[PDB]
């Protein structure tokens with residue numbers, strides 16, 4: 045099934061400025077997209093902002109501005125931040141978009157015509173901050189911002205309020221069996237595995253019907269009207285999840301501006317998502333509600349949902365109100381963009397809540413990027429070792445030579461599998477296991493002595509090293525997109541050989557290829573003092 049590989053991030057609430065969590069989710073989306081482009085596939089990578097709802101409306105009122113001006117301004121902050129982060133995202137969607145609204149109304153009407161929406165009541169707890177309905181088992185006692193006793197979410201700790209409203213209800217209870225059948229038929233469809241198990245357990249227990257509208261006053265009229273009923277607004281989450289469908293149907297011009305909404309998703313060959321990237325906090329929406337809506341509407345289901353953890357800094361919660369900020373742009377200016385991306389993707393897996401510190405950041409940058417990767421690139425390109433400034437023609441390979449070559453040949457298949465799970469941390473570790481092996485081979489062969497002692501042997505050692513650096517760098521190119529270009533330039537790898545599965549093969553760059561010119565004193569990753 046040849047198709048556009050479709051990868052998404054969440055669309056973020058615009059109640060406040062963008063921060064590490066948004067940057068991280070979008071980074072993961074970006075990396076997955078980049079890897080599939082490197083394989084020569086068609087890719088559409090989507091990110092954006094979730095701009096309706098009571099949460100956003102009350103954030104605007106607290107700043108005392110119009111919701112239109114507020115959402116526009118904060119959406120602009122997200123766009124600027126992502127531009128600065130140097131992603132390769134194909135479209136940035138906003139739920140205030142008029143074509144998105146049309147797709148939401150269309151989907152609603154399909155659900156209704158299917159018989160899965162009825163007029164009922166919700167009486168229960170709601171978290172405005174999570175826009176989430178909660179049972180009494182999912183709240184506990186806590187304190188409000190005036191210090192008074194209130195109820196709070198056990199999941200998020202935000203304040204909950206009791207809602208009692210005549211609402212349109214979606215028959216979620218009727219999809220239990222079909223959802224379980226979907227999880228069991230596709231046991232890789234939620235990653236990591238323990239989060240898949242959580243979803244299955246939750247759905248096993250039973251599902252209540254879900255409120256998919258609210259009275260218009262509650263939302264301060266900042267939402268999409270229910271087709272045929274002006275007194276109701278569409279649940280912000282049904283509106284929000286629909287962004288994935290809208291995005292799959294938007295034709296986008298060179299400037300990244302939407303110019304047309306197509307009638308049917310098949311026309312652009314994107315829907316359904318191959319990967320939805322999300323945080324663990326929004327798993328039920330994506331793994332339970334979304335597939336149920338899609339089943340009701342007769343739409344195909346996503347292939348994989350990958351849910352990551354939440355970051356801390358110096359083992360404490362990241363917060364402006366407390367004394368612990370973590371600004372990605374600032375840290376990227378300090379340590380480098382590719383380096384910061386590397387750290388975020390290497391330091392933690394999707395099953396973990398990662399922790400940043402300047403100490404650990406510096407140790408990875410010095411140890412892995414400078415001492416392992418950078419040092420190797422400089423060694424095989426130096427005029428002192430590579431006297432002719434080119435890829436030599438290798439002579440006969442020893443067993444030691446071949447053992448390293450085997451690792452280099454095996455690497456693409458292994459990295460590929462990890463990128464597809466996806467488990468980016470493991471992909472990175474696999475590549476760096478090969479970089480460490482190449483370094484120990486270089487140390488063991490001492491090519492600097494071979495220049496005088498055995499130039500023929502040096503040709504072999506040097507060729508293996510160059511090719512190892514090239515293959516590893518290609519597989520890291522989604523992680524270090526700017527630095528990989530610098531590496532390929534230093535190596536003189538022609539543009540055509542910088543992507544495509546043909547170039548996963550050992551030996552793709554021929555002997556006699558000239559290295560790129562040298563710039564005096566210009567290192568790849570400069571080591572930084574440990575403060």
Ligand code: MET
Nearest residue numbers: 054055056057094284285
């Ligand atoms: C359809 S993904 C919506 C995610 C939600 N706006 C959030 O920031 O958590």
